[PDB]
Amino acid sequence: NAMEVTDVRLRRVNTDGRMRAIASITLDHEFVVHDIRVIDGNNGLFVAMPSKRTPDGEFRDITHPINSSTRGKIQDAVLNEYHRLGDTEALEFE
Template identity: 45%
Template structure:
């Protein structure tokens, strides 16, 4: 299974959650609401989950082995950084825009 697309849909400046991403696999399966978290001096991802009646959370979808989890985490975090820089560059260009 190959990651064929990653879209970072929302960015957050405040708090440990930095972004929410959608990941597409083999151009045929999309997983939404993958969270990019920065805590304890590192980035990591949190898979989509739901809250159980007892207050605990359970992943809706998750990697089965650590190799795939590492590859997924690296790809999502790399995409986050690329898209963050691109969005900051776009904001700088808007700030420097001349209106005629």
Template identity: 45%
Template structure:
């Protein structure tokens, strides 16, 4: 099973960095993954629902640790790329604003 598309919606919140949708083999999509800044770095959280006792249960999740790591690597790489692009665009916009002001 291959990850064929990753859609990232970055956020400006402290620990929650982005919402993510991933598509597998161009035929199956999972919505609602999250990129979270944890105490030991960023990680990908699977979509979950809150149970009556206040705990959370994953709605969908990988069965093997190897596939979980693959999802995490692909998602975090895509997140870093989109953040890098957004930072570059902001830098370019600031340069254009500075030129316009002068």
């Protein structure tokens, strides 16, 4: 079995800057990953894994998807929920 984003918790960020939300994902109903950032980079919204700067100047994620596909399956879930919070709130407005 492949792994599965099974839940997303998300907090919208309203301070301007690039970052639009910070979230956690639940993998397999079981494992939670914190500090995932939703960002407006000059090419569309994208999801960054929690990352660590090396004493080296450089950067690696603490939590790394191996394929770009599983990356995208993490990204989709987070962007989906994000936008879904957008338009459940919108519809509430009346």
